[PDB]
C-alpha cells in the first residue's frame, strides 16, 4: 500500500 | 556539497518498489515491492543476489536485524514475516494486525520488532517466539512509520492523524505527542542518530527536524514534492551531514542539515522516488521508485 497514493 | 553520481540501476521487481535498506554490515541492499517479493542486491556492485518469497500480497517495508542476518517485512496480507536471509527461510509469520502492515523495524538488540499498520496500532513483537508482546492504541489513522531509538528504549510512531508519538518500549506508555501546526498527515518519522531528535515528513511537502522533548522544530527542509506518499527520509552521515529524501517529482533531494539548503538533486528515475537509504560506512545512496519505473538506483559520492 505504500506504493499507492493517498488522495490529499 | 556532495557529488552523488549514478553507478548502478537495479531491475527485476515487476511492480512498484516500496522500500530499500542497506544491511548494517554494508554488504547488501534489501528491497521490497508491491510484487510480493523481497530482493537482495550487492551494495557495492548492484548485483542481484536473490529473491525471497512468501507474502501473499504486496510488501510496504523491509528492515534488517542488527547482525545483518535477518529481515522483517510488512505486507498488505496483514502480516510481518521474519526471514533468515542466507537460507531464504521464513522463520516466523507475525500475526495480529487487522489491516495492512505498513512499516517495520528491529530494535538495536534485534530481539524485538515494531510494526505500524492501517489498523491504527503499533505492535511490538518478540523475534524469537514470533509473539506480539504489546499492542499500542497509538493513532486514530494509519501508522506510517515506526522506529526505535539508539538504545531501543523508545519508539517513535507517525500517522496520517497528524501526530508523532513517543512510546516507552518496556511499558508501552505514550510519553509524548508532538503537535505540528495544522496537523498535516505525517508520512514518515525516525529518530536522529543521537536519539535527541526526530525527522518527520508531512504530506505538505515538508520535512522537519524536531527536538521532540521540547516540541520545538529546529530545522525545516523544503523544495521537494510530497503530498501523497509515505516517502522515507534519511540522515546521511558518512561524509557531509545531509538529509536525504525521495520526492514525487522523481528526484532524490539532498539537503545540508544545518543550513537547510538543497545541495543536490539526483535525476534519473521516471516515477516517484518512494524510498532512499544511506550506506552505513560509504557515501552511497540507494533510491527506489514506483510502478512506472520499478528500478532501484545506487549512487556514490566522493564526499
| Residue in B with minimal Cα distance to A5 | B228
Q: B19 and B292 in contact (C-beta within 8 Å)? A: no
Minimal-distance CA residue of chain A relative to B289 = A3
- Of B84, B80, B103, B104, the C-alpha closest to B93 is B80
**Cβ separation of B100 and A1 shorter than 8 Å?**
yes
* Homologous superfamily, domain B1-303: YVTN repeat-like/Quinoprotein amine dehydrogenase (2.130.10.10)
Residues of A in Cβ contact (< 8 Å) with B203: 6, 8
Please name the helix (run of DSSP H) or strand (run of DSSP E) that holds residue B287, with its range, or none: strand B284-289
The resolution of the experimental structure, rounded to one decimal in Å, is: 1.7
**Minimal CA separation from A4 to chain B, in Å:** 7
Burial grade of B181 (CB within 10 A; 0-12, 13-18, 19 or more): exposed
Q: Lay out the sheet containing B28-33: strands in order across.
A: B17-22, B28-33, B37-42, B48-53
Rounded CA-CA distance B182/B206 in Å is 13
- The beta-carbon neighbor of A2 closest among B102, B160, B203 is B102
Given a contact cutoff of 8 angstroms between Cβ atoms, the answer to whether B223 and B261 are in contact is no
The residue in chain A having the minimum alpha-carbon distance to the alpha carbon of residue B62 is A2
Strand partners, B38: B32, B52
Task: From chain A, pick out residues whose CB is under 8 angstroms from the CB of B33.
Answer: 3
Could you write out the DSSP letters of every residue in B139-203? -SS-EEEEEE-TTSSEEEEEETTSEEEEEETTT--EEEEEE-TT-PPEEEEEE-TTSSEEEEEET
Alpha-carbon distance A1 to nearest alpha carbon in chain B (angstroms): 6
d(CA B241, CA B239): 6
CB B226, CB B206: distance < 8 Å: yes
Strand runs labelled E in B27-142 = 28-33, 37-42, 48-53, 59-64, 70-75, 79-84, 90-95, 101-106, 112-117, 122-126, 132-136
- Hey, is B57 helix, strand or coil? coil
Q: What method did the depositors use to determine the structure?
A: X-ray
For B222, other C-beta atoms within 10 Å of its C-beta total 15
Residues from chain A that touch B60, judged by Cβ atoms under 8 A, are: 1-3
Which of B15, B118, B290 is facing A1, going by the closest CB pair? B118
Amino acid at each position: 500500500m505504500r506504493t499507492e497514493p493517498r488522495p490529499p | 556539497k556532495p557529488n552523488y553520481a549514478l553507478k548502478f540501476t537495479l531491475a527485476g521487481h515487476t511492480k512498484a518498489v516500496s522500500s530499500v535498506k542497506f544491511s548494517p554490515n554494508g554488504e547488501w541492499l534489501a528491497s521490497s515491492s508491491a510484487d510480493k517479493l523481497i530482493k537482495i542486491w550487492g551494495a557495492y556492485d548492484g548485483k542481484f543476489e536473490k529473491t525471497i518469497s512468501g507474502h501473499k500480497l504486496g510488501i510496504s517495508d523491509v528492515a534488517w536485524s542488527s547482525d545483518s542476518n535477518l529481515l522483517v517485512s510488512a505486507s498488505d496480507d496483514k502480516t510481518l514475516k521474519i526471514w533468515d536471509v542466507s537460507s531464504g527461510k521464513c522463520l516466523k509469520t507475525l500475526k495480529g494486525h487487522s489491516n495492512y502492515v505498513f512499516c517495520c523495524n528491529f530494535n538495536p538488540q534485534s530481539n524485538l520488532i515494531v510494526s505500524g499498520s492501517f489498523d491504527e496500532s503499533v505492535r511490538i513483537w518478540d523475534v524469537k517466539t514470533g509473539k506480539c508482546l504489546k499492542t499500542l492504541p497509538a493513532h486514530s489513522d494509519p501508522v506510517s512509520a515506526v522506529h526505535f531509538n539508539r538504545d531501543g528504549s523508545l519508539i517513535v510512531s507517525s500517522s496520517y492523524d497528524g501526530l508523532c508519538r513517543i512510546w516507552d518500549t518496556a511499558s508501552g506508555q505514550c510519553l509524548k505527542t508532538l503537535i505540528d501546526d495544522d496537523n498535516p498527515p505525517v508520512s514518515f518519522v525516525k529518530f536522529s542518530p543521537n536519539g535527541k531528535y526526530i525527522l518527520a515528513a508531512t504530506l505538505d511537502n515538508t520535512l522537519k527536524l524536531w527536538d521532540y522533548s521540547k516540541g520545538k522544530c529546529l530545522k525545516t527542509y523544503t523544495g521537494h514534492k510530497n503530498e501523497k506518499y509515505c516517502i522515507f527520509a534519511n540522515f546521511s552521515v558518512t561524509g557531509g551531514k545531509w538529509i536525504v529524501s525521495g520526492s514525487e517529482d522523481n528526484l532524490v533531494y539532498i539537503w545540508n542539515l544545518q543550513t537547510k539548503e538543497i545541495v543536490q538533486k539526483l535525476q534519473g528515475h521516471t516515477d516517484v522516488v518512494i524510498s532512499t537509504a544511506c550506506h552505513p560506512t560509504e557515501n552511497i545512496i540507494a533510491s527506489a521508485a514506483l510502478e512506472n519505473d520499478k528500478t532501484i538506483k545506487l549512487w556514490k559520492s566522493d564526499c
